[PDB]
Design an enzyme around this catalytic site. Structure first.
Site, short mmCIF file in Angstrom:
data_model
loop_
_atom_site.label_atom_id
_atom_site.label_comp_id
_atom_site.label_asym_id
_atom_site.label_seq_id
_atom_site.Cartn_x
_atom_site.Cartn_y
_atom_site.Cartn_z
N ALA A 20 -0.94 -1.83 3.69
CA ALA A 20 -0.50 -2.85 2.32
C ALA A 20 0.34 -3.93 2.62
O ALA A 20 1.01 -3.73 3.53
CB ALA A 20 0.07 -2.53 1.12
N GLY A 79 -4.35 5.75 11.97
CA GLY A 79 -5.88 7.16 11.31
C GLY A 79 -5.58 8.56 12.20
O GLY A 79 -6.81 9.33 11.88
N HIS A 126 -10.33 -1.75 -8.69
CA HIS A 126 -9.75 -1.29 -7.92
C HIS A 126 -10.20 -0.19 -7.13
O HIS A 126 -11.12 1.20 -7.78
CB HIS A 126 -8.00 -0.41 -8.46
CG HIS A 126 -7.12 0.27 -7.54
ND1 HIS A 126 -7.17 1.90 -6.90
CD2 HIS A 126 -6.22 -0.17 -7.18
CE1 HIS A 126 -6.35 1.83 -6.21
NE2 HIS A 126 -5.62 1.11 -5.97
N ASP A 139 -4.57 1.13 7.86
CA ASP A 139 -4.88 0.81 6.42
C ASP A 139 -3.25 0.64 6.07
O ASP A 139 -2.62 1.62 5.97
CB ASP A 139 -5.22 2.13 5.69
CG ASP A 139 -5.32 2.27 4.35
OD1 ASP A 139 -6.66 1.79 3.78
OD2 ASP A 139 -4.96 2.70 3.77
N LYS A 162 5.77 -12.90 7.44
CA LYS A 162 5.22 -12.68 7.89
C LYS A 162 4.39 -12.00 6.88
O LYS A 162 3.24 -11.66 6.51
CB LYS A 162 5.39 -11.09 8.80
CG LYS A 162 6.28 -11.75 9.71
CD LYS A 162 5.85 -11.75 11.20
CE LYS A 162 6.54 -12.57 12.70
NZ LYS A 162 6.34 -11.77 13.60
NA NA Z 1 -1.27 3.49 6.47
#
Ligand code: NA
Ligand code: NA
Ligand code: NA
Ligand code: NA
Ligand code: NA
Ligand code: NA
Lengths: 344, 344
Positions: free
Chosen positions: A174, A304, A115, A172, A222
């Site tokens: 998941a 960001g 990780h 960023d 998706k």
């Molecule tokens: Na993010």
């Protein structure tokens, strides 16, 4: 209750050294976790230090990897040798930018890692070197595939970054509705979670983070497709563990994980041109900031942007941590003879 | 009512030649649209032929581009010269695979192109050559950014593909909840659409495709971030139009679009190895197919799997088209002296 990030960073590093990690590895991990907390991404911050240290203690992490790198033109393969993810990933970042400087682009396939925390941190670092960056990592299965009822793929996040005059655009995400780290954070904070994130062991949605069995893919098909893209690039292509073949950091203590990562750096100087790229990024950034906000929003933010604002604020006012996380970190400090700093 | 795909393909090509397109351009467009219909992706099929031809008629499309290509190591820039998207994209595919064969990977930045249809078609073609493929294209703004109330980004789709023993894994997805083409298809079929796809001109959700003003990003912030990634790679990096700078195919008839595309091909032979890659892809494919289905599903399918099944079926039983689309195609045929085939 906020804490001095510099003190926590030094503390974590010291605890890691005490646990057996070599200097570069301890620094890499302390960096990755605290930097995540600074940006308000607690799901990948010090909340993870305890399990990271326990993995090392159990003998499932290489405390001082050599990190063999094999270059083949604009492509390179990195053997993490089961070292801490942040340590492995940072070398991958260096290799990627070096390749891009020489060939115009550089792709690094990483195997035998663990990780590595917030993927966005690595993409951001590459972008600060002037490159367009794409970073992915697979993970042990926690997500059902679209149309399935059993876990088949990891939350497999992807990160992307590019320099702009106003700052560094950093995405960023998941590929599942939510990262498992956000479920863990909710548990530590004692909060409920959106019921669309996952299901209990009986396949029913639940807003109780303590009862989440499996997560769901982002927007059905998706997010499922995106998880597979991340799996192909990070696992299949690299020689690392693939899906069910990846060791579970939280549940399997018999052997190392063998997590894989994929990093790509592109030199805009080889495309539209460095100066032109920055000016064009600046116009895009400007256009998004000029977009009228939707109800409940004061303004539109770039990926960001808020994270960068939070980091500045935390560096000035200190970073926050859930009481339960602090309690666990304190217990960890006592276990390793590196007591929680009362001056932090 | 189904139609012979081979006959429709020949018909479309002939109509395009009649409208002024050169041979390779007419073939590329006929190929792209019919292939989309075959796979059940009507949103990018012959439904688009009328507007494509009208753009040519209006003088907004180059009927016979030279397609200048400039190579720089593993990177290449392609000038579409405002030619039909499919014609431009197919040359980009050839250039990408050629670069990958020589350097291990190949990136092609395309500028001055136009709508190129189904992105997945190009990724699939690259994968059939043995490469892992990543294809993106930007588009005129139709989507609100996360937290915004005005259009700022195109549906900006991304496609990815990789070879497997069982077939070609192909993902094709707009970064907004839905592609605008699906809204158009609903209009032609006379069907309502999911109210989460977009909002009317007053910012309210609507299930009426005829009243959709702007679309929403996939899963809020994540789809927004993905749209920006596609914009950076396809537009900012290439020298093509960027967001609001891209001409609207349906609304602006004063000048060419200047759509941009980005294509990346990776040779697995330079990573884990060609044979190993295929075996590993095969195991992943097998694992997903072995996953127990969720309620309402008979089995789990890989991205592109159902599309491939539909193509085979359509090639044997003929392809379907909405009555309204046929009516428009018939009117188009009369306008150009290439009558709708009664034998189709
Ligand atoms: Na993010
Ligand atoms: Na021990
Ligand atoms: Na011991
Ligand atoms: Na005319
Ligand atoms: Na005429
Ligand atoms: Na699709």
């Amino acid at each position: 209750m906020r804490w001095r990030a510099d003190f926590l960073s030094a503390w974590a590093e010291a605890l890691l050294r005490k646990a057996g990690a070599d200097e570069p590895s301890a620094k890499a991990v302390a960096w990755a976790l605290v930097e995540a907390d600074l940006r308000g991404v607690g799901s990948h911050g010090l909340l993870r230090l305890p399990v990271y240290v326990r993995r090392l203690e159990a003998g499932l992490v290489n405390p001082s990897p050599t990190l063999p790198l094999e270059e083949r033109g604009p492509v390179a393969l990195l053997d993490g040798e089961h070292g801490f993810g942040p340590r492995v990933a940072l070398k991958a970042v260096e290799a990627a930018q070096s390749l891009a400087r020489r060939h115009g682009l550089g792709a690094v396939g990483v195997r035998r890692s663990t990780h590595f925390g917030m993927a966005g941190l690595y993409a951001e670092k590459l972008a600060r070197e002037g490159f367009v960056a794409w970073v992915t990592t697979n993970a042990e299965p926690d997500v059902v595939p679209f149309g399935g009822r059993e876990k088949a793929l990891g939350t497999n996040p992807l990160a992307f970054a590019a320099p702009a005059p106003q700052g560094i655009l950093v995405a960023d995400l998941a590929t599942s509705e939510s990262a498992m780290g956000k479920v863990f954070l909710a548990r530590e904070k004692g909060e409920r979670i959106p019921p669309s994130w996952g299901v209990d062991r009986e396949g029913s949605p639940t807003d109780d983070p303590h009862r989440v069995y499996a997560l769901r893919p982002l927007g059905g098909p998706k997010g499922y497709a995106l998880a597979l893209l991340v799996e192909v690039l990070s696992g299949v292509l690299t020689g690392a563990g693939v899906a069910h073949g990846i060791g579970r950091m939280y549940d399997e203590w018999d052997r190392p994980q063998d997590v894989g990562h994929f990093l790509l750096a592109l030199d805009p100087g080889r495309f539209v041109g460095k100066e032109a790229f920055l000016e064009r990024m600046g116009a895009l950034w400007q256009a998004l900031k000029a977009t009228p906000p939707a109800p409940g929003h004061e303004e539109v933010f770039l990926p960001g942007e808020l994270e960068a604002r939070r980091r500045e604020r935390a560096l000035a006012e200190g970073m926050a941590l859930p009481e339960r996380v602090v309690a666990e970190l304190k217990a960890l400090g006592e276990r390793y003879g590196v007591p929680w700093r009362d001056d932090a």
